[PDB]
C-alpha cells in the first residue's frame, strides 16, 4: 500500500526512509500517485535520468502542472473575474498609503493566481501613483501574489512592467519573483538567480527584500546552494538587525 506507506514515511521524519519507500516503483499508476503526494507536500525527490517515468515523475513532484490544473478548475465554473476592493466589500450598502495598500492586499488575497490583468494594471497604476512612505515594494509583491504560481504570466508581466529606478520597485520585482516561485519546484532558478545577483546590493531594504524573496521562493526545499550563498552573508554588522533576522 505505497500511498499511505509513504504518508507514514513522511510522518516519520526520515527523508532516507521516504526515498526507500518511493524506490520500489513497481506500478506506474501508484508511482505517479505517490509522486503527486511527494510534490504536494513539497518533499524534494532526488534522482536523474535513471528510471522509468523519470521525466513525468519529476514534473509531478516539481508541480509544474499545478498552475495549469488550478486554472482549468477555475475555468470549470469560471471565476476569472477581478473584483474591486469595494466589491469584495459592499460599501454601496451604506486615499492615503494606509488604505491604498490595504485595498491592494485585499485584491491580492481575493484574486489568487487568477491573472487580474486589466484590474491588475489599474490597481498597479493606482498604487504606483500612491507610492508614499510604506507604499513600497509591498504592492509589487502583491502583484506577485495575484500571479502566485503563475511562472509564465507572473514572470512575464513583472518583467515587461517592472524594475527601472525606485529600488523599492526593484525589490518589489524580486519579491514578486520569489512569490511566483514559492512552493514552485523546477531546476530553473528564475527567482534564485536574480535574488543571488541582487543579494549583495548596498541598499539595505532592497537587499532585505531580495533575501526574503530568495528564502520564500524555495521555502522548505532544504537544498544547500542558497544556504551556502546566504549563511556567509548572515553577518549583518554592516546592515541592520532586521536584515539579520529576515535572513535568518
Amino acid at each position: 500500500r505505497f500511498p499511505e506507506a509513504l504518508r507514514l514515511a513522511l510522518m516519520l521524519n526520515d527523508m532516507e526512509l521516504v526515498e526507500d519507500i518511493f524506490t520500489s516503483c513497481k506500478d506506474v499508476v501508484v508511482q505517479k500517485q505517490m509522486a503527486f503526494m511527494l510534490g504536494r507536500h513539497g518533499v524534494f525527490l532526488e534522482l536523474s535520468e535513471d528510471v522509468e517515468e523519470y521525466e513525468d515523475l519529476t514534473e509531478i513532484m516539481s508541480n509544474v502542472q499545478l498552475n495549469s490544473n488550478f486554472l482549468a478548475l477555475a475555468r470549470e465554473l469560471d471565476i476569472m473575474e477581478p473584483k474591486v476592493p469595494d466589491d469584495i466589500y459592499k460599501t454601496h450598502l451604506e486615499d492615503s498609503a494606509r488604505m491604498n495598500l490595504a485595498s491592494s492586499f485585499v485584491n491580492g488575497f481575493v484574486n489568487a493566481a487568477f491573472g487580474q490583468d486589466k484590474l491588475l494594471t489599474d490597481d498597479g497604476n493606482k498604487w504606483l501613483y500612491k507610492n508614499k512612505d510604506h507604499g513600497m515594494l509591498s504592492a509589487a509583491a502583491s502583484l506577485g501574489m495575484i500571479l502566485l504560481w503563475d511562472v509564465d504570466g507572473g514572470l512575464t508581466q513583472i518583467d515587461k512592467y517592472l524594475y527601472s529606478s525606485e529600488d523599492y520597485i526593484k525589490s518589489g520585482a524580486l519579491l514578486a519573483c520569489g512569490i511566483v516561485n514559492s512552493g514552485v519546484r523546477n531546476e530553473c532558478d528564475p527567482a534564485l538567480a536574480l535574488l543571488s545577483d541582487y543579494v549583495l546590493h548596498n541598499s539595505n531594504t532592497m537587499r532585505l527584500g531580495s533575501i526574503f524573496g530568495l528564502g520564500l521562493a524555495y521555502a522548505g526545499s532544504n537544498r544547500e546552494d542558497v544556504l551556502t550563498l546566504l549563511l556567509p552573508v548572515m553577518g549583518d554588522s554592516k546592515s541592520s538587525m532586521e536584515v539579520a533576522g529576515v535572513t535568518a
Partner: protein, 33 residues
C-alpha cells in the same frame, strides 16, 4: 549607479526570458511526448 544597475537588470531580464522559453519548449515537448 542607477543606469548601470538598470542595464544589468534588463540584461538579466533577456537571459531570464531565454530560460523561460527554454522551459516552455521542454515542458511542452515532454507533455506532447
Amino acid at each position: 549607479l542607477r543606469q548601470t544597475e538598470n542595464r544589468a537588470t534588463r540584461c538579466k531580464v533577456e537571459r531570464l526570458q531565454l530560460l523561460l522559453q527554454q522551459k516552455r519548449l521542454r515542458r511542452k515537448a515532454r507533455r506532447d511526448a
